[PDB]
Amino acid sequence: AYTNSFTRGVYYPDKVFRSSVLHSTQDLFLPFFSNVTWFHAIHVSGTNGTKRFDNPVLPFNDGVYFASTEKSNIIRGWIFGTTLDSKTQSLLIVNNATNVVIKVCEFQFCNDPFLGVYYHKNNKSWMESEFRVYSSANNCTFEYVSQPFLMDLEGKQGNFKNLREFVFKNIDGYFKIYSKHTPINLVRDLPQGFSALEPLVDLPIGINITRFQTLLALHRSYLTPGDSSSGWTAGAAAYYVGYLQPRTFLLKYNENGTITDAVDCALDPLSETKCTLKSFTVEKGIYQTSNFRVQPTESIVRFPNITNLCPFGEVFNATRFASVYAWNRKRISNCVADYSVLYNSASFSTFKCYGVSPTKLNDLCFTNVYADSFVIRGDEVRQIAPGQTGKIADYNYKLPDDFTGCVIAWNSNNLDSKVGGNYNYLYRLFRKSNLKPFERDISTEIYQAGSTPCNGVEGFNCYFPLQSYGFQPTNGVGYQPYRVVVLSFELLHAPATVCGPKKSTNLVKNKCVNFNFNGLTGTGVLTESNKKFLPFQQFGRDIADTTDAVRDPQTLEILDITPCSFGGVSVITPGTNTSNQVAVLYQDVNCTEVPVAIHADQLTPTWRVYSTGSNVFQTRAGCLIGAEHVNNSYECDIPIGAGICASYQTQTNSPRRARSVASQSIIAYTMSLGAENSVAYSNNSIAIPTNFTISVTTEILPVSMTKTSVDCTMYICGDSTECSNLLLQYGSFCTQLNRALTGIAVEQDKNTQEVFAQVKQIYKTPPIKDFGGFNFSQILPDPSKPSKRSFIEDLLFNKVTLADAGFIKQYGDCLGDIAARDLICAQKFNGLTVLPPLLTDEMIAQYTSALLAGTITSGWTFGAGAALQIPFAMQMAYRFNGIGVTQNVLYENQKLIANQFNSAIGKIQDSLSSTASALGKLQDVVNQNAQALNTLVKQLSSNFGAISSVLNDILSRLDKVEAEVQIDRLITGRLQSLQTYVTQQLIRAAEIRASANLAATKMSECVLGQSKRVDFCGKGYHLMSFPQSAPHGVVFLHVTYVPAQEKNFTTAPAICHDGKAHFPREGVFVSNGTHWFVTQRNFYEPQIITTDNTFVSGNCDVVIGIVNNTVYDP
């Protein structure tokens, strides 16, 4: 009975307070949807190998998730440890049902906690016995009592069956216990749903747990009615087991601050979107996510085919050394070092290691080493460091300003002593000959140069820098002789040659695996190197340290370190409300390795992803799984690349079909760009429209976003004194950036008023509305709303999150508090601000309305200058003249033009209202600032390598002097991140103001006059255009012409009448097939071919195209 751990195992990792935040992190987690070993009964061979024991001892394996159910209190406690005996320490963790008792005692092995053994009474056994499992308590170490973990007490309130889901962990010796209780109804299968597990007690027990079991106390059974021997264990408590693995997650809360749901950050390519995006709902499109890797484990990986220890003790058990001046160097090479037995034994007085941190010594492969043997005076040892100076340092031995291995110093009065003392060591005295690191000078400085202004010619007597060291064994301490060696490692100058005493193991290929080549501890898949290497080349960093290929130091063969098969992972999903399945794409990677792996591929189970027989597909964009190609091409919604798209809205597959799955199948195809049609080229004929279908489109444009700002400081500084002290010593940085905030913010308002204040004066609707049958109702404002806010823009407002997803009312705030007047944004907590527009919506609107009124009633003139009356009839007529249509057509066809107009308006509102997110760019900016702002928010929480992210604590619990560096590093980082944030807003400021200029143009040209530019203001011959604001934006109605209902017409540019080539003044000569007439290109107005509607010039004969006809002259 193995069963998916459907969603069970998730807990509370730490007790840091938080509310409704998608924080991703990683720990030892039982896999979800994962097999859990049921352990139920005594069923045959479940009791063999034991003493009729039902639920065997099990491997700990780094973590256990534990769960039991019952009708009534049955399941007793557990026992943990290495071996569960008195030989090795044990853990006895028992629920007395009166109290939970936890003991790390060394109790004798219990084959059964319930064995038929007892010695106080009649010899059989039973619960008559007083906890017979309590074998003996010798060398007990820990004892603890707490409240029971009662199992039925959960189920008592609701009269149901229950479970208790458990996670036992031992991290850093701390044995953390996380808990939960819940009712069930099904006992056959693991329930679907969700729950969280919270820490009960941490126990710093510090025993390597590897074996564990569950304990039960057998009373009896009633399966067969014979005797007390019918005390069958069959029908005893069952349970599940799984183990915990280091995989990443995501975790969520509710209003009450409690976990209600989670999305896994190590489960599924689909799930990884909801992880990385930090959403529980992913939208339609293509989304790229983070790659994966396998467990961190490996042996001593690959040290050279060299294996022989170095003779270190010679340096160390040596009785003949030199003085501090006579600092010798000794060569270490071509052997295996050890720094365990070196480090471990108790001989060294000084051991301190520089630029090198002393643990992994025995896994360090070195190129070469330098043993600096000499004897020092006891107090001088502190001066053995870079940054020291002194007679020994400045005049016996110096240090470079780069890495030197170690310092080893130790008293030598057991070998440097003669009862008469030791004058037998020496050092140089100062003589102003200051030198550089590592001069083995032994020159006798008896006479100087002489011309030096500090020596030679300066007042000397019998002085000799060679100063002997006079030891005495009866002299005391401080000046006792201290033999000292300077360890200095060269690394990376060559193949490393001397390694620590750690034998490496074999190597694997093509699997994502770490490794360590002579200290080169790297990772990836191992691909055979196709390079003719060069034999004095060990590792090839093809560019900028990228040690691309490696030659192993045991087999001497070359290996391209391909970083384990590397290629982007992106998803193809229709959304979340749509469905919960995904296509798996890898970027320019042929699916030849694992197609896709969460830590490994799998053949039959839920990871079923095959490069053949599964939903494999191959492109220049790399191989696809999930995606089955199909031949038919259509348009693209979720892109992939090269037109290859995985988006069919309506599939022929019924069951799943979501938008990218097709009955459990992601589909594959390419953008079809539209239909296919030859238009019949001829050299002599047109089709000129005999009707039209004008259209009005929706040109949607954001005009602004929030003029936020920040108290840079109180953002950062949170109003702290020493905070501000260190803050200022950086300085105007804050000032710089928020000055930018200023310029850009005021800038956007200038942009807005700019896109609005094009006119001197303000117009109102004329009360009578007899405007040629063109209804303006819905576009126009109505007094019923505050300040005559137009129907259309009201819909705009409602269609958008005026609240902007409520940045006054997301995860709420201080409720009803200083949060001021209920519509803008921005969740102000501290440091930050936003300032409401200089132009509130109301003016913004009534501008636009004045715009409208002018362009209707006075047309060209209201913004150009004085607004002058004109019938919008003949105004529209002149605008047809602007698109080149005579006022004849409008005159004749005024009513249907009106009707199309107003119907178009209605369709406009139909769209904008019905179509959600029609406004993309608007709410785009909204979202943009949303994240920018909110990120900025989160960035307070970045500890930045400090010991705490909050300024408060880092200042508080620290004395200032040390607090200086942490405070600083934080100042640096958060400051920096702000400055970044600033920069990004700047990015917008730019692209915004660009769009803003664009839109100001859009209005000015297409509205104060008539756009005559191609697709500037919408497809077609523009007539008029109209302003439709958004709280940070504007949309535009556009009156453009589209002809229709065409018919063939053979043509002739000239009419060859009366020996003279006659041509049409305005248009082209047209025929029905038999009658030659004149009409222009955008409509059939066949005309009697007159000299009035034509003209004569040149000759008719020389060039093709003409016909012969007659022409009528006035």
Numbering used by the authors: 27 to 1140
Reported in the publication:
The spike (S) protein has two distinct subunits, S1 and S2, and the receptor binding domain (RBD) in the S1 subunit interacts with the host cell receptor. The S proteins of SARS-CoV-1 (virus causing SARS) and SARS-CoV-2 (virus causing COVID-19) bind to the same host cell receptor, angiotensin-converting enzyme 2 (ACE2). After binding to ACE2 via the RBD, a protease on the host cell surface cleaves and activates the S protein, allowing the virus membrane to fuse with the host cell membrane. Here, using the S1 domain of SARS-CoV-2 S protein as an antigen, we screened an extensive DNA library and found a standalone VHH that is specific for SARS-CoV-2. This new VHH (termed K-874A) bound SARS-CoV-2 S protein with higher affinity than previous VHHs and does not require any modification with antibody fragments, making them a very attractive therapeutic candidate.
To estimate the K-874A binding region on the S protein, we reconstructed the cryo-electron microscopy (cryo-EM) structures of the recombinant S protein trimer and its complex with K-874A complex, and fitted each molecular model to the maps.
